[PDB]
Amino acid sequence: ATAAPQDVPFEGTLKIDVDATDLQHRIFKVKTTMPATPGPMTLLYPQWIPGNHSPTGPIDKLAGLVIKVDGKVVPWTRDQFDVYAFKVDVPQGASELVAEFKFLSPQASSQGRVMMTPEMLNLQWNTTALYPAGYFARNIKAQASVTLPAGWSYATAMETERRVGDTVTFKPIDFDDLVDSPMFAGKYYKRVELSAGKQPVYLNVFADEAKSLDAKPEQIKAHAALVQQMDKLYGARHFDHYEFLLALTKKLGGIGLEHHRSSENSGAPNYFTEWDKSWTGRDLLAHEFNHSWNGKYRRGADLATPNFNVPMGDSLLWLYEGQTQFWGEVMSARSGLWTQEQARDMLAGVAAQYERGRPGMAWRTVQDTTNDPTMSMRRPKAYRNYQMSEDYYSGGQMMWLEVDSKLRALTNNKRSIDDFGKAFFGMKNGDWDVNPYTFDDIVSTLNGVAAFDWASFLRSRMDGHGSLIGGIEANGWKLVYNDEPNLATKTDESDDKDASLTYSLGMSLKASGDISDVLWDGPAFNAGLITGNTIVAVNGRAFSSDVIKDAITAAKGTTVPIELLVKRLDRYDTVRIDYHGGLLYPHLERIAGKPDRLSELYKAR
Amino acid sequence: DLLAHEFNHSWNGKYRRGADLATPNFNVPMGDSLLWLYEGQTQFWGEVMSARSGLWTQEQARDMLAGVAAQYERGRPGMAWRTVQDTTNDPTMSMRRPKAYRNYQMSEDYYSGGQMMWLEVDSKLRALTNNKRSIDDFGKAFFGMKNGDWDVNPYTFDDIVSTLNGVAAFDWASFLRSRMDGHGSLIGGIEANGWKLVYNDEPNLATKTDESDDKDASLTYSLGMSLKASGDISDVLWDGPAFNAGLITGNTIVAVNGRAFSSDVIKDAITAAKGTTVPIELLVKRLDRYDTVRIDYHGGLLYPHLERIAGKPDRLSELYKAR
Numbered sequence: 001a002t003a004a005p006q007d008v009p010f011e012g013t014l015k016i017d018v019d020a021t022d023l024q025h026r027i028f029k030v031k032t033t034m035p036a037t038p039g040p041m042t043l044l045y046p047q048w049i050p051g052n053h054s055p056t057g058p059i060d061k062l063a064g065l066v067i068k069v070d071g072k073v074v075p076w077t078r079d080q081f082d083v084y085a086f087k088v089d090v091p092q093g094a095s096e097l098v099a100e101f102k103f104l105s106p107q108a109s110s111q112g113r114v115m116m117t118p119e120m121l122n123l124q125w126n127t128t129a130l131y132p133a134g135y136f137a138r139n140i141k142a143q144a145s146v147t148l149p150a151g152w153s154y155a156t157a158m159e160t161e162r163r164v165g166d167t168v169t170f171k172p173i174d175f176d177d178l179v180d181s182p183m184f185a186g187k188y189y190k191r192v193e194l195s196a197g198k199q200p201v202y203l204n205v206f207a208d209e210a211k212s213l214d215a216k217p218e219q220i221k222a223h224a225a226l227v228q229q230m231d232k233l234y235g236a237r238h239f240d241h242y243e244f245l246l247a248l249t250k251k252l253g254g255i256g257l258e259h260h261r262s263s264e265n266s267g268a269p270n271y272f273t274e275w276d277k278s279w280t281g282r283d284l285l286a287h288e289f290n291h292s293w294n295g296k297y298r299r300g301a302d303l304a305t306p307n308f309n310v311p312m313g314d315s316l317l318w319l320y321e322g323q324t325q326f327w328g329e330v331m332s333a334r335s336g337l338w339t340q341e342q343a344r345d346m347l348a349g350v351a352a353q354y355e356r357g358r359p360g361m362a363w364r365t366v367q368d369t370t371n372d373p374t375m376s377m378r379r380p381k382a383y384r385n386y387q388m389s390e391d392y393y394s395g396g397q398m399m400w401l402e403v404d405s406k407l408r409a410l411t412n413n414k415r416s417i418d419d420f421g422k423a424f425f426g427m428k429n430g431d432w433d434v435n436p437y438t439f440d441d442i443v444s445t446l447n448g449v450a451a452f453d454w455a456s457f458l459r460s461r462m463d464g465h466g467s468l469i470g471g472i473e474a475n476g477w478k479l480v481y482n483d484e485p486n487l488a489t490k491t492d493e494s495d496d497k498d499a500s501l502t503y504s505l506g507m508s509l510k511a512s513g514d515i516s517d518v519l520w521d522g523p524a525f526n527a528g529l530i531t532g533n534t535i536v537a538v539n540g541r542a543f544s545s546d547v548i549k550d551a552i553t554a555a556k557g558t559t560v561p562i563e564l565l566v567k568r569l570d571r572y573d574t575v576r577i578d579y580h581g582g583l584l585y586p587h588l589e590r591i592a593g594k595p596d597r598l599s600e601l602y603k604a605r
Numbered sequence: 606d607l608l609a610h611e612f613n614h615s616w617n618g619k620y621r622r623g624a625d626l627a628t629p630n631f632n633v634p635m636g637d638s639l640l641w642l643y644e645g646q647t648q649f650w651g652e653v654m655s656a657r658s659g660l661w662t663q664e665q666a667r668d669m670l671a672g673v674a675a676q677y678e679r680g681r682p683g684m685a686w687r688t689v690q691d692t693t694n695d696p697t698m699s700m701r702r703p704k705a706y707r708n709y710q711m712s713e714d715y716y717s718g719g720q721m722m723w724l725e726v727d728s729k730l731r732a733l734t735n736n737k738r739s740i741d742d743f744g745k746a747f748f749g750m751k752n753g754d755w756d757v758n759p760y761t762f763d764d765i766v767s768t769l770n771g772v773a774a775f776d777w778a779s780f781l782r783s784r785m786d787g788h789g790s791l792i793g794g795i796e797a798n799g800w801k802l803v804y805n806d807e808p809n810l811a812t813k814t815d816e817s818d819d820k821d822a823s824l825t826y827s828l829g830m831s832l833k834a835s836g837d838i839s840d841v842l843w844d845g846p847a848f849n850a851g852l853i854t855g856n857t858i859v860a861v862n863g864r865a866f867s868s869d870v871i872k873d874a875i876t877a878a879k880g881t882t883v884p885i886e887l888l889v890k891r892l893d894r895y896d897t898v899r900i901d902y903h904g905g906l907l908y909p910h911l912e913r914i915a916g917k918p919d920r921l922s923e924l925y926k927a928r
């Protein structure tokens with residue numbers, strides 16, 4: 001019901017002034033000022049947010065909305081068929097419209113991710129913005145300011161005009177870049193140089209406590225190496241400068257969100273201080289950084305929408321996210337954020353997920369999972385393994401691994417997926433506007449690296465129900481299962497003594513015995529068990545992770561079922577599970593006769 | 606009954622005291638042999654006087670007495686080997702430290718077992734005298750001398766006998782010894798004074814009040830155990846059904862016929878098992894292990910009450926009546 005945005009000039013400047021001082025209530029106070037055009041005027045609250053691929057704009061957290069034209073309140077009417085659109089009537093001869101409101105950010109995780117704490121805050125300008133309908137967002141010149149808690153430091157890719165006391169005024173910027181230029185602020189801050197030169201890269205760290213900022217030299221070097229390895233892959237940087245934003249916290253809501261010249265990232269307080277325990281999540285900065293090339297600069301044409309209030313088409317997210325998931329893990333190994341053994345066991349877990357952990361592939365394609373952002377909005381799902389769940393990430397990753405192996409085979413290892421990366425994202429160094437692409441562009445660039453029917457290859461994997469893990473064998477390794485723990489599973493389990501048993505009993509458990517996941521058609525599923533039931537005892541003994549694992553091993557090769565005493569709501573029963581395969585965890589093993597292209601792929605350049 | 610109990614001791618215990626208990630200083634041992642008078646008859650008068658004074662209703666006092674009677678009819682299997690007299694040694698033996706089986710080791714039964722004997726003494730005094738004398742006459746004769754005197758006036762066993770004989774001639778020495786040195790019934794005073802101990806599924810008023818608010822489950826006369834609302838067993842009756850399933854205090858009843866434990870859940874299952882041949886299935890936690898036991902108990906919920914014997918004179922109500 002809101003008129004379509006037009007690629008026409010916007011006269012004047014959209015001023016967005018935010019007071020971010022009410023940490024106790026977690027309220028962002030907002031004033032938006034813009035020229036007022038006589039007649040009906042519709043203002044938009046951003047709905048579809050770039051990088052979320054879904055209508056995540058928190059419309060019901062916009063409160064206290066009062067709109068004044070030249071100082072006189074004008075009543076507003078919401079469009080009942082577009083609840084993000086507010087309509088007012090501007091009198092003839094008017095000059096200026098001011099909208100004031102408050103963004104009531106989450107006071108608990110049940111409302112969304114927390115954005116204010118006693119020590120830090122995360123300002124996402126889309127949550128504090130109203131903008132006129134009828135214009136391509138990039139045509140609206142904007143200028144933002146923020147009043148910070150007293151004395152706090154801040155970081156953002158957006159250039160500062162002046163700080164007066166605790167009020168930071170930024171230089172004017174196009175409105176789409178404003179939304180794409182989030183800010184972290186906090187009292188415990190460290191700025192770390194990752195790459196000097198004409199297109200510099202910095203790491204901005206905020207923490208709950210100052211002791212978490214003590215990054216050691218080798219740990220900083222791994223982040224600096226990430227930047228160096230991206231240069232080798234792409235040969236260009238799509239920014240004039242880049243600002244990593246990293247929150248080390250137990251209070252701010254978790255985040256990984258890419259932008260052209262920055263990314264919003266969260267880690268635990270021990271990101272640096274316990275480097276060897278916090279490794280499984282360290283592909284995060286590599287992942288989001290890669291999006292500066294793959295997602296921000298190059299974007300699918302159906303995803304690159306003209307404003308924030310028309311729907312996004314996610315059809316090509318298996319490139320956007322899929323190949324970024326691939327490069328995040330590859331680049332973690334190439335830079336030293338991960339060890340080679342860590343990256344290899346992680347890849348083994350991905351391969352196992354599609355060989356045995358995704359029975360839903362029998363009926364649903366990876367391509368259809370590009371609709372999961374809008375279908376589910378990351379709300380809880382009963383069977384991620386059977387409904388599927390954004391597999392354009394990891395399923396896409398496996399496809400790109402096979403693409404790499406095929407490029408090598410076609411060219412006697414003279415070309416690889418690195419050549420696609422440079423060809424598709426390496427043009428136009430320094431540009432950070434949007435360069436759209438279609439499916440045919442992907443095929444054409446791949447064909448330019450090595451001639452082959454890439455259109456049929458891509459569609460057969462993304463529209464099919466068959467194996468996605470062919471890149472493992474083609475690049476010289478084989479997926480196996482044994483009772484040796486997977487490094488990723490072990491690290492993810494060991495803090496609370498949880499039990500991941502996907503490939504043995506077909507479920508995962510918390511240390512409490514509560515079932516946290518059940519594999520469709522697996523042994524636990526076939527006993528009627530669901531997530532939320534509790535394993536009370538194993539063969540009569542009070543549950544623990546060691547107890548149930550010992551029982552699985554004890555049942556290997558026998559005919560005596562494992563007796564699980566189960567609590568289902570307010571009832572207790574004993575189920576007999578005839579599982580005798582023992583503990584099974586995925587790993588990769590070399591195929592001795594074939595060249596090891598996998599290790600070449602994961603090797604630093 | 607607390608203030609009635611301790612007040613009665615001003616007469617029975619402080620003023621009149623057994624000679625072996627009335628020691629010359631605080632640092633030579635006390636002889637407790639006569640505590641079934643000191644505490645036993647005071648336990649008796651504490652409850653009687655609660656009814657006479659209105660601290661308790663008559664219905665409350667009657668259900669309390671029913672619980673005492675049931676305790677010695679069915680709740681004290683230890684009487685098969687231990688006498689009430691020997692429990693006067695429990696203060697020094699145990700110092701009220703925790704014991705596994707109050708019902709089998711016995712536990713200061715000179716209180717409530719003594720109370721039951723004194724009820725029977727009352728009934729016998731009435732029977733010997735065509736209801737012209739009662740235990741009230743022993744109270745006045747034994748403790749009613751020397752108004753205003755609060756020095757200690759010691760007594761021996763023979764003094765108890767002679768004063769009882771003065772109320773109504775009878776071989777009181779053999780009577781007292783037969784009850785305090787015996788292993789047989791102590792509840793004869795109930796029927797002699799016109800009532801009968803019965804059990805049914807109607808809650809005992811004392812048990813109900815003691816159960817309430819915390820949602821506990823006293824099941825002594827059905828499953829032979831008591832439980833907290835959590836399912837933790839708080840008591841087990843020797844040779845009862847729970848005992849015969851190997852259960853001990855501290856074990857936990859996790860489920861009843863598969864349903865998560867509650868006091869209502871286990872009570873409903875007991876009622877559902879009344880008159881059938883389907884055992885009650887209890888899921889039990891014993892330390893860190895779980896097992897299911899089958900209890901073949903089909904008597905239903907059983908709580909003690911007193912009921913009139915219609916043909917007999919109601920002396921019990923006279924005893925509990927305000928004077």
Ligand SMILES: CC(C)C[C@H](NC(=O)[C@@H](O)[C@H](N)Cc1ccccc1)C(=O)O
Binds near residue numbers: 052256288291321
């Ligand atoms: C902490 C990490 C798990 C974060 C990780 N982030 C990403 O993949 C980003 O590149 C995504 N662009 C973040 C995203 C995608 C879809 C809907 C909402 C948010 C994610 O999976 O959300």
Ligand SMILES: [Zn+2]
Binds near residue numbers: 288321
């Ligand atoms: Zn991503």
Ligand SMILES: [Zn+2]
Binds near residue numbers: 610611614644647648
């Ligand atoms: Zn007393």
